[PDB]
C-alpha cells in the first residue's frame, strides 16, 4: 500500500496554496489540524479565506489566506498544519499525509 | 450531570462535553450582556464545533476571537452548554467561564 501522493505548497503574497496530484482517478480531502489534534474539514468559506479548486492539470488545490482561519503567526511566519487524505471515489482513505505549511520559506 | 472540561492551549482553548445515550449538546457564546451567539464554522470569530471519534463534542476558540475578554491578565470566554433530548427539549443548561493565562508584556520589567 505505497503512499506516493505528490504534493507541494507555494507561498504567495496574500496567501498560500497546497497542491496535490492524485493518480488513478483518486481525489484528496484537506483537513486543518489545531494544537489539540482536532481535524477541521476544509470547505469554501470566504470569510475564513479558505477555497478549494481543481487545476487544469487535474491537481487539487487548497488555498488559504495568510490571515484566514487557523493560520498562526510563529517566529514571524504564517503557519498552517494540514492533513491530506488520499481517497478513492468510494470515500475510503487510502493514505494520510501531514504537512506543515510555513510561509515565507524556510 | 453532564461531563465536560476545557483545555488552555498556546493559541486557543477547547471545551469538551460528553453527553449520554441519545442526548446532544448545543453551544452558545455569551457576552457581558447575556446574548447567546450561535457557533458556526465559517466565521470571522475564530470558533468551531466538531464531533470527536468517541462521539464527544468539541468547541474550539482562538484567543483573539469574538467575545474573548481580557480580565486580570487572562483570556476569558463564557459559553453556555444546552444538553438536549432527541425531542428538541433542553434537558439541562450549564454555563462555563473558560479562563486561560495571558502573557504580560515586557513592561512588567519596568
Ligand atoms: C464544523 O465542521 C465539522 C467538521 O470539521 C462538522 O462536524 C460540524 O458539524 C461543523 N459545524 C458547523 C458547520 O456548525
Ligand atoms: C469554491 O470556490 C472556488 C473559487 O471561487 C470555486 O472555483 C469552486 O467551484 C468552489 N466550490 C467548490 C470547491 O466546491
Fill in the keyword field for this structure.
homodimer, 106 residues, mainly beta, five-stranded antiparallel sheet, four-stranded antiparallel sheet, globular, binds 2-acetamido-2-deoxy-beta-D-glucopyranose, Zona pellucida sperm-binding protein 1 (chain A)
Tell me what the structure shows:
The PDB classes it as cell adhesion. The entry lists the keywords Zona pellucida, ZP1, ZP-N domain, ZP module, ZP domain, egg coat filament cross-linking, egg coat penetration by sperm, cell adhesion. The structure is a homodimer. Chain A is mainly beta. Chain A is 0% helix and 56% strand. Chain A has strands at residues 6-11, 15-21, 27-33, 39-41, 50-54, 60-65, 72-74, 77-87, 93-103. The A-B interface holds A 34-36, 38-40, 43, 45, 47-48, 69, 72 and B 7, 9-12, 14, 41-44, 46, 48, 50, 58, 60. Bound molecules: 2-acetamido-2-deoxy-beta-D-glucopyranose (NAG) (2 copies). One 2-acetamido-2-deoxy-beta-D-glucopyranose (NAG) binds at residues 44, 51-53 of chain A.
Describe, in short, the structure shown.
Chain A is mainly β.
Oligomeric state of the chains present here:
homodimer
SS strand fraction of chain A: over 45%
- Coarse structural class of chain A: mainly beta
Number of domains of chain A: 1
Question: How many β-strand runs of chain A?
Answer: 9
Q: What is the rounded Rg of chain A?
A: 13 Å
Sum up the overall morphology of chain A in one term: globular
Q: Major beta sheet of chain A, specifics?
A: 5 strands, antiparallel
Please provide the ordered H/E string of secondary-structure elements of chain A. EEEEEEEEE
Instruction: List cofactors, ions and other ligands.
Output: 2-acetamido-2-deoxy-beta-D-glucopyranose
N/C terminus separation of chain A: 31 Å
Largest interface: A-B, 12 and 15 residues
* Helical stretch tally of chain A: 0
Helix content of chain A: under 10%
Amino acid at each position: 500500500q505505497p503512499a506516493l501522493l505528490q504534493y507541494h505548497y507555494d507561498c504567495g503574497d496574500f496567501g498560500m496554496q497546497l497542491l496535490a496530484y492524485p493518480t488513478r482517478g483518486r481525489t484528496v480531502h484537506f483537513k486543518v489540524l489545531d494544537e489539540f489534534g482536532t481535524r477541521f474539514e476544509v470547505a469554501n468559506c470566504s470569510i475564513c479565506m479558505h477555497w478549494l479548486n481543481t487545476g487544469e492539470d487535474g491537481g487539487l488545490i487548497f488555498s488559504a489566506g495568510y490571515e484566514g482561519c487557523h493560520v498562526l503567526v510563529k517566529d514571524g511566519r504564517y503557519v498552517l498544519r494540514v492533513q491530506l487524505e488520499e481517497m478513492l471515489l468510494s470515500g475510503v482513505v487510502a493514505a494520510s499525509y501531514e504537512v506543515q505549511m510555513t510561509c515565507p520559506r524556510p
